[PDB]
Amino acid sequence: MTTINTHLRETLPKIPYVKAIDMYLMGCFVFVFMALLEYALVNYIFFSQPAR
Amino acid sequence: VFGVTTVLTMTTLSISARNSLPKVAYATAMDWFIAVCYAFVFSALIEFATV
């Protein structure tokens, strides 16, 4: 996701405002980040409680 | 994997961000921010190594 957004941005001028595809990519990155965060939250509580 | 990937990402980012500006011989502010972030990341890797 990071690389996708970087390279995509490189092809446009240096505009201050967030575009629409930038908003979509930020949303997708938030979803991926939260997915990894949830995995780590499972890993943290897994030894104490195996059903949660 | 966390540590090595975060360091690799920070390296690629420090390389990409510098590409925009002309090749000046001093350190800008964004460069200071990138350096501090690289410090934090490497310190976390070294904390995992110690643990």
UniProtKB/Swiss-Prot annotation, chain A:
Question: Altering residue 32 to I: what's the impact?
Answer: In IECEE2; uncertain significance
- Tell me what the record says results from residue 20 to V: In IECEE2; uncertain significance
Quaternary organization:
Heteropentamer, formed by a combination of alpha (GABRA1-6), beta (GABRB1-3), gamma (GABRG1-3), delta (GABRD), epsilon (GABRE), rho (GABRR1-3), pi (GABRP) and theta (GABRQ) chains, each subunit exhibiting distinct physiological and pharmacological properties. Interacts with UBQLN1. May interact with KIF21B. Identified in a complex of 720 kDa composed of LHFPL4, NLGN2, GABRA1, GABRB2, GABRG2 and GABRB3.
The beginning of the lineage is: Eukaryota, Metazoa, Chordata, Craniata, Vertebrata
Q: Which residues lie on this side of the membrane: Extracellular?
A: 9-26
Q: What does this chain do?
A: Beta subunit of the heteropentameric ligand-gated chloride channel gated by gamma-aminobutyric acid (GABA), a major inhibitory neurotransmitter in the brain. GABA-gated chloride channels, also named GABA(A) receptors (GABAAR), consist of five subunits arranged around a central pore and contain GABA active binding site(s) located at the alpha and beta subunit interface(s). When activated by GABA, GABAARs selectively allow the flow of chloride anions across the cell membrane down their electrochemical gradient.
Superkingdom:
Eukaryota
Q: This chain belongs to which protein, by name?
A: Gamma-aminobutyric acid receptor subunit beta-2
From Swiss-Prot, chain B:
The listed locations are:
Postsynaptic cell membrane; Cell membrane; Cytoplasmic vesicle membrane
Q: Which residues lie on this side of the membrane: Extracellular?
A: 19-28
| Transmembrane annotation, as ranges | 1-18, 29-50
What quaternary arrangement does the UniProt entry report? Heteropentamer, formed by a combination of alpha (GABRA1-6), beta (GABRB1-3), gamma (GABRG1-3), delta (GABRD), epsilon (GABRE), rho (GABRR1-3), pi (GABRP) and theta (GABRQ) subunits, each subunit exhibiting distinct physiological and pharmacological properties. Interacts with UBQLN1. Interacts with TRAK1. Interacts with KIF21B. Identified in a complex of 720 kDa composed of LHFPL4, NLGN2, GABRA1, GABRB2, GABRG2 and GABRB3. Interacts with LHFPL4. Interacts with NLGN2. Interacts with SHISA7; interaction leads regulation of GABAAR trafficking, channel deactivation kinetics and pharmacology.
* Family of this protein: Belongs to the ligand-gated ion channel (TC 1.A.9) family. Gamma-aminobutyric acid receptor (TC 1.A.9.5) subfamily. GABRA1 sub-subfamily.
According to the UniProt entry, the note on domains is:
The extracellular domain contributes to synaptic contact formation.
Q: What does this protein do?
A: Alpha subunit of the heteropentameric ligand-gated chloride channel gated by Gamma-aminobutyric acid (GABA), a major inhibitory neurotransmitter in the brain. GABA-gated chloride channels, also named GABA(A) receptors (GABAAR), consist of five subunits arranged around a central pore and contain GABA active binding site(s) located at the alpha and beta subunit interface(s). When activated by GABA, GABAARs selectively allow the flow of chloride anions across the cell membrane down their electrochemical gradient. Alpha-1/GABRA1-containing GABAARs are largely synaptic.
Which disease is given in the protein's UniProt record? Epilepsy, childhood absence 4: A subtype of idiopathic generalized epilepsy characterized by an onset at age 6-7 years, frequent absence seizures (several per day) and bilateral, synchronous, symmetric 3-Hz spike waves on EEG. Tonic-clonic seizures often develop in adolescence. Absence seizures may either remit or persist into adulthood. Epilepsy, idiopathic generalized 13: A disorder characterized by recurring generalized seizures in the absence of detectable brain lesions and/or metabolic abnormalities. Generalized seizures arise diffusely and simultaneously from both hemispheres of the brain. Seizure types include juvenile myoclonic seizures, absence seizures, and generalized tonic-clonic seizures.
Remarks, anything else? Functions as a receptor for diazepines and various anesthetics, such as pentobarbital; these are bound at a separate allosteric effector binding site.
Q: What is this protein called?
A: Gamma-aminobutyric acid receptor subunit alpha-1
